[PDB]
Amino acid sequence: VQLLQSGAAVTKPGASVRVSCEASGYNIRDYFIHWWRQAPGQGLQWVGWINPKTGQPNNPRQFQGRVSLTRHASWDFDTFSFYMDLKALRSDDTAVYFCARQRSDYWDFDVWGSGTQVTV
Amino acid sequence: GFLGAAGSTMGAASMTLTVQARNLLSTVWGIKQLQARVLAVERYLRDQQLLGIWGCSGKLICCTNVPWWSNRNLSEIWDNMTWLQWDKEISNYTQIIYGLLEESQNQQEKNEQDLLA
Amino acid sequence: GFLGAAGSTMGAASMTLTVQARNLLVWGIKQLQARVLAVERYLRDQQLLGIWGCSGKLICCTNVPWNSSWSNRNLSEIWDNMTWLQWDKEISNYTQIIYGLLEESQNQQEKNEQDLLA
Amino acid sequence: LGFLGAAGSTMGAASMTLTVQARNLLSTVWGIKQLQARVLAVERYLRDQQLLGIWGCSGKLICCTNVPWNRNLSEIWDNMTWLQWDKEISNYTQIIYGLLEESQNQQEKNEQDLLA
Amino acid sequence: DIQMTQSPSSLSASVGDTVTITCQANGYLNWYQQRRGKAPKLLIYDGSKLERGVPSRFSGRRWGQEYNLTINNLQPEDIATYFCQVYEFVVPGTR
Amino acid sequence: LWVTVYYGVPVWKDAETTLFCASDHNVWATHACVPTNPQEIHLENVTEEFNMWKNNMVEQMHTDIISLWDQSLKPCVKLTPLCVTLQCTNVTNMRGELKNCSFNMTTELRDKKQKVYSLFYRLDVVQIKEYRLINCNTSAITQACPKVSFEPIPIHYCAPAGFAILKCKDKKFNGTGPCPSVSTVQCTHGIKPVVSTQLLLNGSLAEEEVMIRSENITNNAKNILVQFNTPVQINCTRPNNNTRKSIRIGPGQAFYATGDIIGDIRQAHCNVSKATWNETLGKVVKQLRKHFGNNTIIRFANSSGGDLEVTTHSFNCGGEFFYCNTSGLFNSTWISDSITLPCRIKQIINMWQRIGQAMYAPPIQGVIRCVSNITGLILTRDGGSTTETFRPGGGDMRDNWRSELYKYKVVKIEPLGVAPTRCKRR
Ligand SMILES: *[C@@H]1O[C@H](CO)[C@@H](O[C@@H]2O[C@H](CO)[C@@H](O[C@@H]3O[C@H](CO)[C@@H](O)[C@H](O)[C@@H]3O)[C@H](O)[C@H]2NC(C)=O)[C@H](O)[C@H]1NC(C)=O
Ligand SMILES: *[C@@H]1O[C@H](CO)[C@@H](O[C@@H]2O[C@H](CO)[C@@H](O)[C@H](O)[C@H]2NC(C)=O)[C@H](O)[C@H]1NC(C)=O
Ligand SMILES: *[C@@H]1O[C@H](CO)[C@@H](O[C@@H]2O[C@H](CO)[C@@H](O)[C@H](O)[C@H]2NC(C)=O)[C@H](O)[C@H]1NC(C)=O
Ligand SMILES: *[C@@H]1O[C@H](CO)[C@@H](O[C@@H]2O[C@H](CO)[C@@H](O)[C@H](O)[C@H]2NC(C)=O)[C@H](O)[C@H]1NC(C)=O
Ligand SMILES: *[C@@H]1O[C@H](CO)[C@@H](O[C@@H]2O[C@H](CO)[C@@H](O)[C@H](O)[C@H]2NC(C)=O)[C@H](O)[C@H]1NC(C)=O
Ligand SMILES: *[C@@H]1O[C@H](CO)[C@@H](O[C@@H]2O[C@H](CO)[C@@H](O)[C@H](O)[C@H]2NC(C)=O)[C@H](O)[C@H]1NC(C)=O
Ligand SMILES: *[C@@H]1O[C@H](CO)[C@@H](O[C@@H]2O[C@H](CO)[C@@H](O)[C@H](O)[C@H]2NC(C)=O)[C@H](O)[C@H]1NC(C)=O
Ligand SMILES: *[C@@H]1O[C@H](CO)[C@@H](O)[C@H](O)[C@H]1NC(C)=O
Ligand SMILES: *[C@@H]1O[C@H](CO)[C@@H](O)[C@H](O)[C@H]1NC(C)=O
Ligand SMILES: *[C@@H]1O[C@H](CO)[C@@H](O)[C@H](O)[C@H]1NC(C)=O
Ligand SMILES: *[C@@H]1O[C@H](CO)[C@@H](O)[C@H](O)[C@H]1NC(C)=O
Ligand SMILES: *[C@@H]1O[C@H](CO)[C@@H](O)[C@H](O)[C@H]1NC(C)=O
Ligand SMILES: *[C@@H]1O[C@H](CO)[C@@H](O)[C@H](O)[C@H]1NC(C)=O
Ligand SMILES: *[C@@H]1O[C@H](CO)[C@@H](O)[C@H](O)[C@H]1NC(C)=O
Ligand SMILES: *[C@@H]1O[C@H](CO)[C@@H](O)[C@H](O)[C@H]1NC(C)=O
Ligand SMILES: *[C@@H]1O[C@H](CO)[C@@H](O)[C@H](O)[C@H]1NC(C)=O
């Protein structure tokens, strides 16, 4: 069970940024994928999950209309790619973004991603 | 042999119960035999349970308590009539007896002994 | 009817054993498996009933002494107030050793005695 | 001491462990192969139980019969095992079974019926 | 609603001593230890059971609405930030 | 004193076993189901502990429905010469929904070929003006075999000998917990195997009022199941008048294309009544307010996103697969005439959430109309929260089946007991 991550991205204000994870090591369709972002010198912040089987996302009121979560499986359903799009970069959107695998109803994220630096 | 006492009277056909009793148990062709085996086992087991509930376990001839429709005399019944004619004649009255023996008559008798001992 | 006396006490549920006793017997394998499983379960239960010397009887008395270690309650209360389901959990722990005692002490020695004295 | 644990023991000592032998009799590829065994075991058990029931010995591990018979019992029960007994006496078992079926059971039913 | 707090803030435990980090919450709680400039890692899940691959010294216990994690035989490598998350709510943690 | 053995005592234990079908030319093969007035016995003085989220009836029903779906697609035609390079043009010169696509095809003789055409929907073709079928790179097509019908019919689930099915007769019954009015039965009522994602159709209505059931309401990742006490009528229609044309692609192999449409091309759609939906939403809000503050704001909204199966109300009406835009219903915000839902039609179907195999669906001639009764809802709640908002969701059929089997359970009878008595064996 291993996930992956993309490199750091620098974007101008009023642009779009895309961050991608990739899970290759296990039965992907049976576990949710969650996204988190951490501001510098602050605790973790919750971004919504995505259901790999049907693709329906769930985002909080703060990120409604600005974040999109999609997944794209490959042939033989051996690898998955989970993307995250942010529509309008603002001043205080700088943070570090992680993708995590929820194992069970306890909401315990055993596997995490490397992380990505997003700066405006 | 098997079913050989068919034409004989109920008096002379009740002495050979064992010979009929033995033969109860005894890929297209591989599925039509397993069905027969399971069906035979099930029918034999159902008949054995029906015998056992009434108080008749391992007994080919029983005597039970309920009184005794028919108006014929005993000599007439056991002298000339055969088993099949009796079965065809009295098929209606069987269900009354079947529930009568198992429900009360045995169930009562299974208690007084427990009360007595 | 079937399971009608489930809520009734032990005293009033002992007169209805025959109702449960006579109801114990794709889309092509799911019927055969059930038909053979019912027979196997019925034969196993009847074998255990028979090897204790109780074959053919719904209510049989046994000469195995009952100690208070397994359970101890007043005979007036047990048969008048509490239910069979309530009693099932209370004595469920010690059933196996009771069955083991019934195995040889109830019938085997008495079988040998009957063999010698006949 | 267990299943078939008195195989070498003398008949007198082997007759005390009837229950341990009597208890184990009942209980895609390897999907039908298990079902065949499941049906076969039930069939064999039912056949043996029917044979016991016909003779009037139903539900009895040590039965007594009404069929009369060298071979003094002292040497048989003290100096032999069940296997040698089987090898020696297997010839006559069919006629013994035939006598047991009707010579002593159906008759007993007739006298019991006529008595009451 | 879900209300959860982590009072201890910063601590000054020394090497070779026993440390305790306490919190209060309702619902399932999990403890994570994050080193500076690295991804978080799960130590104890459900707040009482420890994930396979962590030394047995780390132990967390729950009583009523008060949970806390105790570490004994502290080592220099254990200087990270410890925080507890219920479902989607996290607190900055303790360092 | 002494121990006595009772055979036939009323005692049951939790267990799981295979339950067979009894049902009073069909996908679900109810001919193999045994024939089925059934008796129901009331049990008094008893309170059984029920759980609907962990019962095994739903799993067995799911795998049995999948097996019946699979075994009915074996005899009929395998459409895999149809993966060729199509050439498609517009049907008229709503626009661009239908396409006239022509291609080459084989015939009864191996050395000969023919040129044919058919009318395809825009949702079934993908551009390479050369198109191709949507799934010729992922799966193989088998035809839906017109001799069978897709109309659901009630199915019972009956238990073997030595087992029983317990039922809960509590009117206001929560998903899990004791039931003070347990009864017993041999087997259940008729259950229609209907497939839908966001609205439940032709279901069983509640007796007292609207009920809310979720495994754990605090966890937002689990859906909420809503049951109505009164149905909502919905009329769905397909105005087009199609003609079906048969094409021979081999010895004994037939392909059913579409000749043309008589009259005008009109959009398929469904109608709901506005006032009844308003009352139903008011009742749902009133019941939902019990699991939150008494002054919290309730909201409803369009689906967030995903596949076409979960963002739209999906079903079939008489053999044509409808996907309907439902964003006109969940349009409200609550503080303490008719609605028309445009729909689209699809023929190449990937069913049961499998990506390995697919199915075709022959065109059905004539006008198609359905009148159905909406019984329930499946919702999800946006996390990170006053002002709770709810979106429609679905896609998992176990949620569909669980709304019918929430009261039944299976138990095994154990007819042996040991009891203390004063009697001594002779
Ligand atoms: C929910 O249940 C209703 C039950 O009425 C279903 O409506 C019924 O659907 C069938 C299938 O199309 C209709 O049968 C058809 O009738 C026409 C006209 O007689 C005939 O030409 C066809 O060959 C076919 O037999 C039936 O009339 C219709 N019932 C009513 C009252 O309109 C509905 O389809 C179900 N919904 C779902 C999603 O399953
Ligand atoms: C949802 O899950 C939570 C956490 O697993 C459950 O919280 C438990 O609730 C019971 C009864 O209220 C308490 O005895 C436990 O101590 C709680 N566990 C905790 C706080 O970790 C909650 O009950 C669940 N919801 C439902 C409806 O069952
Ligand atoms: C769809 O078109 C067909 C023609 O192919 C119509 O069928 C005719 O219907 C009328 C009305 O009963 C009959 O009198 C004719 O005999 C039918 N066949 C013909 C004209 O060939 C059908 O009615 C149309 N559908 C609708 C809903 O109007
Ligand atoms: C569903 O609702 C639509 C919209 O009201 C109905 O369509 C109307 O039909 C009548 C009768 O032909 C026309 O006079 C109206 O102009 C139509 N409405 C519109 C907006 O064009 C339809 O009849 C209803 N019933 C169905 C589709 O079965
Ligand atoms: C949906 O279709 C049904 C059935 O055609 C419609 O019910 C009709 O309602 C009118 C009055 O509004 C009655 O006069 C008719 O008798 C009803 N039909 C039948 C067959 O009885 C209903 O109006 C339609 N529209 C909805 C439910 O919005
Ligand atoms: C959610 O609502 C919005 C608008 O109410 C729908 O989004 C529209 O989608 C069309 C499709 O191309 C766009 O042209 C519009 O611009 C979108 N609206 C806005 C305001 O941008 C959306 O379809 C609804 N959700 C679902 C699942 O249908
Ligand atoms: C589902 O229905 C909604 C409501 O009709 C659609 O939202 C409209 O989309 C059109 C597309 O250009 C826009 O012009 C309208 O402004 C939208 N309405 C509102 C209120 O914003 C939505 O597009 C439909 N979904 C799909 C996939 O077509
Ligand atoms: C098949 O083709 C479609 C259309 O381009 C594409 O979206 C899809 O990803 C392809 N299948 C796979 C397994 O890549
Ligand atoms: C057939 O009937 C005759 C006439 O009574 C009788 O003598 C004979 O024994 C019967 N045969 C059998 C096999 O019972
Ligand atoms: C920390 O430990 C216990 C758990 O063992 C916890 O319940 C309590 O709040 C704390 N106890 C003390 C003495 O601080
Ligand atoms: C148990 O059920 C019987 C039968 O209806 C009833 O008479 C009795 O009162 C019930 N027990 C109690 C405690 O109510
Ligand atoms: C055919 O439909 C396409 C897609 O809407 C459109 O761009 C084109 O103008 C139409 N007419 C043609 C190709 O003659
Ligand atoms: C059918 O095949 C012929 C080969 O001669 C080709 O010229 C023609 O374009 C094909 N038709 C289509 C619709 O692809
Ligand atoms: C539903 O009806 C009530 C009362 O008639 C009204 O206040 C409310 O606005 C209606 N809802 C919508 C969405 O129009
Ligand atoms: C309801 O939907 C209409 C069109 O679908 C839209 O204009 C409106 O903003 C929505 N919300 C309302 C009326 O509150
Ligand atoms: C709703 O429709 C179903 C099937 O068409 C029908 O059985 C049911 O009776 C209807 N609802 C009412 C209240 O009649």
UniProtKB/TrEMBL annotation, chain F:
<feature type="glycosylation site" description="N-linked (GlcNAc...) asparagine">
    <location>
        <position position="100"/>
    </location>
</feature>
<feature type="disulfide bond">
    <location>
        <begin position="270"/>
        <end position="324"/>
    </location>
</feature>
<feature type="glycosylation site" description="N-linked (GlcNAc...) asparagine">
    <location>
        <position position="278"/>
    </location>
</feature>
<feature type="glycosylation site" description="N-linked (GlcNAc...) asparagine">
    <location>
        <position position="45"/>
    </location>
</feature>
<feature type="disulfide bond">
    <location>
        <begin position="83"/>
        <end position="136"/>
    </location>
</feature>
<feature type="disulfide bond">
    <location>
        <begin position="317"/>
        <end position="370"/>
    </location>
</feature>
<feature type="disulfide bond">
    <location>
        <begin position="88"/>
        <end position="101"/>
    </location>
</feature>
<feature type="glycosylation site" description="N-linked (GlcNAc...) asparagine">
    <location>
        <position position="302"/>
    </location>
</feature>
<feature type="domain" description="Human immunodeficiency virus 1 envelope glycoprotein Gp120">
    <location>
        <begin position="1"/>
        <end position="93"/>
    </location>
</feature>
<feature type="disulfide bond">
    <location>
        <begin position="324"/>
        <end position="343"/>
    </location>
</feature>
<comment type="function">
    <text>Transmembrane protein gp41: Acts as a class I viral fusion protein. Under the current model, the protein has at least 3 conformational states: pre-fusion native state, pre-hairpin intermediate state, and post-fusion hairpin state. During fusion of viral and target intracellular membranes, the coiled coil regions (heptad repeats) assume a trimer-of-hairpins structure, positioning the fusion peptide in close proximity to the C-terminal region of the ectodomain. The formation of this structure appears to drive apposition and subsequent fusion of viral and target cell membranes.</text>
</comment>
<feature type="glycosylation site" description="N-linked (GlcNAc...) asparagine">
    <location>
        <position position="90"/>
    </location>
</feature>
<feature type="glycosylation site" description="N-linked (GlcNAc...) asparagine">
    <location>
        <position position="235"/>
    </location>
</feature>
<comment type="similarity">
    <text>Belongs to the HIV-1 env protein family.</text>
</comment>
<feature type="disulfide bond">
    <location>
        <begin position="236"/>
        <end position="270"/>
    </location>
</feature>
<comment type="function">
    <text>Surface protein gp120: Attaches the virus to the host lymphoid cell by binding to the primary receptor CD4. This interaction induces a structural rearrangement creating a high affinity binding site for a chemokine coreceptor like CXCR4 and/or CCR5. Acts as a ligand for CD209/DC-SIGN and CLEC4M/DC-SIGNR, which are respectively found on dendritic cells (DCs), and on endothelial cells of liver sinusoids and lymph node sinuses. These interactions allow capture of viral particles at mucosal surfaces by these cells and subsequent transmission to permissive cells.</text>
</comment>
<feature type="glycosylation site" description="N-linked (GlcNAc...) asparagine">
    <location>
        <position position="137"/>
    </location>
</feature>
<feature type="glycosylation site" description="N-linked (GlcNAc...) asparagine">
    <location>
        <position position="241"/>
    </location>
</feature>
<feature type="disulfide bond">
    <location>
        <begin position="158"/>
        <end position="187"/>
    </location>
</feature>
<feature type="glycosylation site" description="N-linked (GlcNAc...) asparagine">
    <location>
        <position position="174"/>
    </location>
</feature>
<feature type="glycosylation site" description="N-linked (GlcNAc...) asparagine">
    <location>
        <position position="373"/>
    </location>
</feature>
<feature type="region of interest" description="V5">
    <location>
        <begin position="386"/>
        <end position="393"/>
    </location>
</feature>
<feature type="glycosylation site" description="N-linked (GlcNAc...) asparagine">
    <location>
        <position position="216"/>
    </location>
</feature>
<feature type="glycosylation site" description="N-linked (GlcNAc...) asparagine">
    <location>
        <position position="325"/>
    </location>
</feature>
<feature type="disulfide bond">
    <location>
        <begin position="21"/>
        <end position="33"/>
    </location>
</feature>
<comment type="subunit">
    <text>The mature envelope protein (Env) consists of a homotrimer of non-covalently associated gp120-gp41 heterodimers. The resulting complex protrudes from the virus surface as a spike. There seems to be as few as 10 spikes on the average virion. Surface protein gp120 interacts with host CD4, CCR5 and CXCR4. Gp120 also interacts with the C-type lectins CD209/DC-SIGN and CLEC4M/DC-SIGNR (collectively referred to as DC-SIGN(R)). Gp120 and gp41 interact with GalCer.</text>
</comment>
<feature type="disulfide bond">
    <location>
        <begin position="76"/>
        <end position="145"/>
    </location>
</feature>
<feature type="disulfide bond">
    <location>
        <begin position="270"/>
        <end position="343"/>
    </location>
</feature>
<feature type="region of interest" description="CD4-binding loop">
    <location>
        <begin position="303"/>
        <end position="313"/>
    </location>
</feature>
<feature type="domain" description="Human immunodeficiency virus 1 envelope glycoprotein Gp120">
    <location>
        <begin position="96"/>
        <end position="426"/>
    </location>
</feature>
<feature type="disulfide bond">
    <location>
        <begin position="168"/>
        <end position="179"/>
    </location>
</feature>
<protein>
    <recommendedName>
        <fullName>Envelope glycoprotein gp160</fullName>
    </recommendedName>
</protein>
<feature type="glycosylation site" description="N-linked (GlcNAc...) asparagine">
    <location>
        <position position="294"/>
    </location>
</feature>
<feature type="glycosylation site" description="N-linked (GlcNAc...) asparagine">
    <location>
        <position position="104"/>
    </location>
</feature>
<feature type="glycosylation site" description="N-linked (GlcNAc...) asparagine">
    <location>
        <position position="331"/>
    </location>
</feature>
<feature type="glycosylation site" description="N-linked (GlcNAc...) asparagine">
    <location>
        <position position="202"/>
    </location>
</feature>
